[PDB]
Write a protein that binds this ligand. Structure first.
Ligand SMILES: O=C(O)[C@@H]1C[C@H]2CC[C@@H]1CN(c1ncnc3nc[nH]c13)C2
Length: 167
């Protein structure tokens, strides 16, 4: 039993809710919140900008030190950093950005990072400003992630479409 509430069960291990991931993280304090990161960990907008804003920019300060030490992430890769006031840990995962011409096949590699964590609160990777089809992203998630994932979808219209079209 865990503290996630109000989710629709899609599969054995994938759950979904119309929710603001920032507000959901603030209430649940999950072990792991996933950020929709880019390779530079520049958290300017979308989910990343919202999460970072909720940390009062502490996420960005920590991220800048990480990059200065380690260099950029790979598209499809991840790193574990602090969850600040939102979660124990933040798993920064880089899905391909279609608006940058990155290969969508890398979306499966991106979701594989979730399998290193037993339970996660997450957005749909490569959705929103990353330009991928969220229906496709959900399919890859379900077919790739084997650990327990609680997906937060900000847009109510999109949430209803994801549920209604789910096979
Ligand atoms: O989930 C959505 O509605 C869409 C799919 C992804 C890209 C575009 C939007 C928003 N984006 C998000 N942006 C900011 N906070 C969020 N909390 C959950 N998801 C959030 C996620």
């Amino acid at each position: 039993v865990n503290s996630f509430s109000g989710y629709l069960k899609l599969t054995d291990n994938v759950y979904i809710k119309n929710a603001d991931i920032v507000e959901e993280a603030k209430k649940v304090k999950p072990t792991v919140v996933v950020n929709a990161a880019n390779v530079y960990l520049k958290h300017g907008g979308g989910v990343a900008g919202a999460l970072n804003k909720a940390t009062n920019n502490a996420m960005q300060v920590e991220s800048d030190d990480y990059i200065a030490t380690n260099g950029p992430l790979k598209v499809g890769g991840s790193c574990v950093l602090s969850g600040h006031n939102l979660a124990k840990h933040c798993l920064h995962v880089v899905g391909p950005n279609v608006n940058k011409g990155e290969d969508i096949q890398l979306l499966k590699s991106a979701y594989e990072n979730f399998n290193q964590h037993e339970v996660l609160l997450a957005p749909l990777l490569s959705a929103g400003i990353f330009g991928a089809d969220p229906i496709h992203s959900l399919r890859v998630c379900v077919d790739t992630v084997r650990t327990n994932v609680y997906l937060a979808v900000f847009d109510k219209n999109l949430y209803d479409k994801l549920v209604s079209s789910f096979l």
